[PDB]
Every structure is written in structure tokens, then in C-alpha cells.
Amino acid sequence: GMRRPTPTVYVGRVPIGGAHPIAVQSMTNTPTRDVEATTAQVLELHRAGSEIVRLTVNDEEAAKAVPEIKRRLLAEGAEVPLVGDFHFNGHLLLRKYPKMAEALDKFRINPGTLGRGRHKDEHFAEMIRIAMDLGKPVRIGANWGSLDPALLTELMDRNARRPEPKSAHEVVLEALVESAVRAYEAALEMGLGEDKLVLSAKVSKARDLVWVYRELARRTQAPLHLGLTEAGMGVKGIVASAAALAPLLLEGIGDTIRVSLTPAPGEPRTKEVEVAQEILQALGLRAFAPEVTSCPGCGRTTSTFFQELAEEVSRRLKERLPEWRARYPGVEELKVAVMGCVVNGPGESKHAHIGISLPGAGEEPKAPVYADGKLLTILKGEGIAEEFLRLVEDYVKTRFAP
């Protein structure tokens, strides 16, 4: 289950591929024609951790805005790469607005939103030609919400000739993979470099996504852009996204990710970037920020004190991070434990860089603190929380000193 080798594709300054960290990306939801709102959100997403940012380029007004958005970003020294998302008229917009084409750092094509049969091949070829002329990379991104219907008919007739035809659902997933593979092969044949081609083939159900990506990974050599499309709102969207991605990421499949959450009204667009980072950090693939390991608490602990302490520690680590990031290289790998009682508290604290085990039911009112697998001190009284946070600050300064 080691990382799938792939050629490197640069999206701006960010390399994508088997030799590189899995890159977090996101997409804006502001109208792209609104230069102020869109530039602000691109910066917001980038500051949250979005290494690459996509924006829809849906019409001429959007196309006209892109060079000004890019100008404004550069003016503040924000080197975030921009992906243009094209559907239906990508070939017209790229042809008509060469300054937009040049301002983007990558073009997204969807093989199912090119046009009707004869025109499809030529629309696709025009986009690919422009990308080659400008040295831009392309994502060929299929999505089962926009599956090429002629290809689906071809595969439905192939399936019908089988001694045991597969289900309609299965054929749809075959067709999605085929859509991406065919387009990938067509681009290569036209001369686009392996260093300029990323593929995706998204579906909205986890088990299907796994199947699809295993097929992509086997059939192609490209870096893969992995995501569960239309994952939805709230806890459902978070859970579905994690569930879908983890099996693939653990098998070494995927070179960049996007988490497709529906924000609740008033919820920041940066939530999807947090989720993406948590997925990669949970699986030990990247480290972005200190993490807190804590027990659920049970009838052995005093629920509110323990929950308050864990919350307070997490809050403080988040407040310290900007400073820590600047002073203490490697601090993103910090593991801190906050535990409710003696059953697992010392042991889990010993597995962390530093951890505290509160006293639970039946225990003397003292809280041992462990660091690097051994007892550091024992805390008691009021301000356990502030004392522990001081010990954590001390530990960081020593362990992650430059």
C-alpha cells in the first residue's frame, strides 16, 4: 500500500504526483465576475490551506475578471495557483480571452460537457491545443453527474452482449472510467505532455468512488485528483468524504484532493479545506497542525471538567500555531493527549509527545503529565489547565527548536 508513482505535474509552483505531498485544493463559490469577492475568497481559502484554488469560468464576464483576480493576488505576494473550471463553452472562452487563458495556472475539462458528438472532439482538441500553446496543465475531470450519453449507450450495448450482463449502475461506473481514460489517451496522442495531465472521475457514493479510482489508477499513469463529488451538508458530507477517500489514500492512490461539502447558510467556504487537511493528517500522510488525542470520557471521569480541559487545550494550540509555525520547525507533528482517568490515560499520554491524565473516580486528586513517554510532573489544585499549557509551551520550545 505504498504511494503510486506518477509523473510530476506542476500547477503553478505546486508539484502534483507520486513524488510529492498530496495537495489540498478547493473551489470558490463567489460569482467570478465579482473581482473583489472572488479575490477575497481565493485569499481566504489559500490562507486556510488550500494550495491550489479553482474558480468557475462560466461565461465571458467571468473570463474577463480572471486576469484582474490574478493581478490582485500577485500584488499581495499570493502565489496561489488558479484552476479554471470550464463547461460547455470552454473552447470559446479560452479562444476569445487569451489573457484569461494565460492568467490561469491549469484548465479543467469535463469530457461530458464538451458539446454534442461531432463538435465534442473538436471542442476538446481546441482546449488541448491552447493548453499546449501556453504550457498549461489540464485536468480531464469526468463526473457521473455529467456523463457523456453516447459513450454510455456504447457501453450499455457492450454489456448487453455479455454472457452475464452487469447492472445499469455498474455500466455507468464503467462508462465514467472509460470517459476519463479515452480522453486522457486522446490528449496524449495530440501531444500534451504526461507532465501536463491530471485525471479525475468522481461519483457521489463512497464504495463506487473506490472502485472507479482503483480502475483509473490501474489503467493510467497520470496523477489523480480524488474527491467524492456532491458529498452534501454537515456531518453527513464530512463523514462520506472521509470514508470515501481513506481506503484509496491508504492504498497509495490520489495526488490531490478536494472535499465537496455543501456549506450550511453562513458557514465559511474554508470548512472544506479543514476537512481535507484532517483526512490527510488522520491517515499520517501530511501534518498541518498539532493534534489532540482525548478519550470520550465516561462515568469514571467528571464529564464537564475533562471536556472543558480538552476543549481549552485544543483552543490554545490553535491560538499558538501561527507563532509556532514561524519559530519551531516541525511543530505541525505535535501530538498532545488529554485523558479522563487512569484506565487509558497514562498509556495514551505516553504515546503522545506530551499528555495529561486527569484523575477519575476512586483516584487521588492529582494529574500526571507525561512527555516523551515518561513522567514529567504531577499537577494538582486549580489552574491545572494553565499549568499544562505552560508545560506544552516548554516542551515545544525544546523539541522543535531550530
Place this chain on the structure above:
Amino acid sequence: GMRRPTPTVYVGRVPIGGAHPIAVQSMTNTPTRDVEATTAQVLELHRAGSEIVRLTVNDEEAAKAVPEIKRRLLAEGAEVPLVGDFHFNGHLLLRKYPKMAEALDKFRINPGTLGRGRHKDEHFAEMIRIAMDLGKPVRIGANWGSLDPALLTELMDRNARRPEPKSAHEVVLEALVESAVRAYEAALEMGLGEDKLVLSAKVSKARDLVWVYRELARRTQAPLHLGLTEAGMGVKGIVASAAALAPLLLEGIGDTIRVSLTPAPGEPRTKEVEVAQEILQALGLRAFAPEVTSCPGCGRTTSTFFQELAEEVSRRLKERLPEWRARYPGVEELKVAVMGCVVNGPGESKHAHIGISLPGAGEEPKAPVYADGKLLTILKGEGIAEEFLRLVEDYVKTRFAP
């Protein structure tokens, strides 16, 4: 990647094993001695979907309370099975309080919290004897927060003799597996039935959990209780839990799950049960409630109207569910789509049972609705939301009629 066969273990009326749905469980956080608070929370957890509920049985006052909690549950016709969580003094509490022993529906033993070496074997044997005498099932639950240190030394010396010794971390994971396996074999040898034994071996990091469970699954025949221990707070705990479980569940490993979230202060203990259900539903393993598939929205849609509609649909489905569950068998499998524009909106809506595709940028102000893969109607004007919800109600009545 089909379901691992296992013998069936009944926990109360709930069967656990390869022939049965993966059971959702949880654990209380109230002091077990508080009969009113604990009974209330057991009912709350059970009504949220916890098919089995664990409670700590840490001391004599807790032990004395258990038969009254069980009485109170039965008095309201709540047949929820109770698992007693025992550490350090399990053998003393079960011996001293036979009415507690009989009131429980399953005993949890942790091989690392039995006692010191010589006494450990006898403590374990006493618990197992009582379980056999009463016909109770047992979980032998190892946890790396409470790993038997003598076993770890034995395995550290075995490792040191290897031509290429493994890391200390790797040896810890070996020891955790060995702890569970040895105890399982010991229980079987003493005469406890294969129909009375569930195993777990929990760690707090996802990739390690996968390794551990693949080993358990191979080395034993028991049903497995799967969970990422000490998963933590908030989005991190949710994501880590999903990430850890999905690879295993998709490979067919795991017969019951528990999600080990730390509640934020004032957050209900039922959140962990929601998360558990979302994991299983995301992976197509169980269906608990209708789900909404929605796009993230982008610069093609009007952010707030779309986000409000998706939120409103999700809210309404949740309000209708108790009634629907009673009237319309199978409704838990309902899939509804709410989509932002024409790019993926119709296609994704066609994959749902019923879905709506709002008009995005450039489009006529009309919203097609699809059901069973084909156009049902087209909505326009105000009250699109109420009209769509009426269509969904109509669709449910027809499709899931008894």
C-alpha cells in the same frame, strides 16, 4: 471484499456477527451510581440508534445501581442490551454483586487491566467463569492505552532477536494483537463458547488500527468490535473515526462499531451515535434515514438560495422521518438530490430517487425535478422549496407504500 464470516454472538436480543447487520453501539458518560441520569442517557442513546449501550461498572456503588437501571429500562419496554465495562476489580464486582452480573447483557474485559502477573490469570478466569455460569457473552477488549507490560517485554525481546528488528511502535502493535489473541484462545480453552466471545484491539491512529484489525481478523474467528479509540473532539474526531473504519469495513472486517468522540462541553452524547450511523450509511452497509446529495455550489449558482434549499430539504426529511418510518417500509433507503446548476444537477438528480436541479447562471429561471431517473416536473417562482417537498412526500407514499 465481502463480509468476514463469524459465529453469531447475541448481546441481549441483538445478534453480532458476519450474518448480521453491523450493530451501532455507544457508552454512557454519566456516573453509573446516578440511576436517574444513567437510565435517561441509556434511553437517549438507544432512541438515537444505539443498539447496544455500554456503561462503566467501576466500583461497588456503580455495581449496585445496575440492576435498578435495568429494571427501569424494562419498565418502559426498552429492551436495550447493557454492556458492563470492567477494569481492575471486575472479578471482585461480579463475584460480590451477582444481581449486577445477571442484569448485564455482556461483560467487557480488558487483558491489560486485570492486575499484576500471577493474579491476572486468576482474575481473568474468575470473570470468564461467571460469564459461563450465567450464559453471558464477553468482549475481550485490548486497548493500547492499557497494554499489558509483561507481554510487551516478551515481544520486545523477541523483536530484538530478529535479523532486522522492527520499531518500538511496531512491537507495541504486535503486542496489542497478541494480548487479544492470547486472551481469546485462553477463554475458548476454559470452555467459553464461540457464540459468547467478541474481540477488540483499539489504537488511536487510523493507519495502525487498519493493521491491527487485519491481523485480528486473520488470526481469530470471532466477531470484532471495531473502533478508533480516543478519537478526540470536533471535526478531527469525526474525520479520524471515519477514516479509520472505512478501509476495514469496505474489506468486510467489523461486526459492531463504537465511535469514541470527545463531546464538546454541552454537546450531546448522542453525537457519536449519529457519526457511527453516518459511517455505515456512507459505505452502503446499513440505511438509517433518507440522505441528501447536494453539490458544493460554486460561482454558477446563487450561493444563499441554493444553500438554504438544501438545508430546508434536509431539515424536513428529518422532521418527517418518525412518521415515515412507521408508515413506509424501506424509506430509510431514500436518496434525494438538491443541485445548484445544469452542469451536474440533472445527472445527479437522475441517480437519486428524486432530485431537483436549480437554475444557475445563464439559465432560464426554472427548476427541473427528476424522479426514478426521469423528468417529473419543472418548478418556477416562489415556494419552489415547499413544492419540491410536496413532490418528495408524494414520491415516498408511492415508492415506499407497504
